[PDB]
């Protein structure tokens, strides 16, 4: 029923439009659209806490985590709300994102509007890397592109 869109831009080649659609308030969010300018492989894909690019993607803060828990995969019991896992770019560096998630919302307590969508340099290890960063940001590395998540028509 209610929708969201997001333009990922950054300092290098990474760009693409990512749409959000949530049919009812408690139901799942569909997350789709394509990202280009990526290296082939897995890339971290998160909603970050703050919708702030005063200083590019770095101002977007840590992973949105209103339930104050640890980082994991999208299917893990232990996850921040923004923990949307990996996207996969192909040989041309095109990641055709098609995602369904029941933990993010476009309304209520876990609402992602006005927060930042970030696509990372490396793979999100899902908390399995065996280091301090792994259980925090998934060791996905730097923030290649972002955008504020905004209400769509």
| Residue 29 contact, options its own copies, Zn ion, Cu ion, none, Cβ 5-8 Å cut-off depending on partner type | none
Q: Is 80 assigned a ligand-binding role in the annotation?
A: yes
118 binds Cu ion (CB under 5 A): yes
Annotated catalytic residue: which of 43, 52, 79, 80?
Answer: 80
Instruction: Return the residue of 5, 30, 34, 69 that touches its own copies, per CB under 8 A.
Output: 5
The one among 43, 48, 80, 143 contacting Zn ion by CB under 5 A: 80
Q: Is 143 in the site for Zn ion (CB under 5 A)?
A: no
Number of other CB atoms surrounding residue 94 within 10 Å: 16
* CB contact at 8 A, 32 and 6: no
Residue 31 burial by Cβ neighbours in a 10 Å radius (0-12, 13-18, 19+): buried
Is 83 annotated as catalytic? yes
Q: Which of 35, 14, 153, 28 is nearest to 96 (CA)?
A: 35
For residues 45 and 31, what is the distance between their CA atoms, to the nearest angstrom?
11
Q: Annotated binding residue at 120? A: yes
Q: List the catalytic residues.
A: 46, 48, 63, 71, 80, 83, 120, 143
């Amino acid at each position: 029923a209610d929708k969201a869109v997001c333009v990922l831009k950054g300092d290098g080649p990474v760009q693409g439009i990512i749409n959000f659609e949530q049919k009812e308030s408690n139901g799942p969010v569909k997350v789709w659209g394509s990202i280009k300018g990526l290296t082939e492989g897995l890339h971290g894909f998160h909603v970050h806490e703050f919708g702030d690019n005063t200083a590019g993607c770095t101002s977007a803060g840590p992973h949105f985590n209103p339930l104050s828990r640890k980082h994991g995969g999208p299917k893990d019991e232990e996850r921040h709300v923004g923990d949307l896992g990996n996207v996969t770019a192909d040989k041309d560096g095109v990641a055709d994102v098609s995602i369904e998630d029941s933990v993010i919302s476009l309304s209520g307590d876990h609402c992602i509007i006005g927060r930042t969508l970030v696509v990372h340099e490396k793979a999100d290890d899902l908390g399995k890397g065996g280091n301090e960063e792994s259980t925090k940001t998934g060791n996905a590395g730097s923030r290649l592109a972002c955008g504020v998540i905004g209400i769509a028509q």
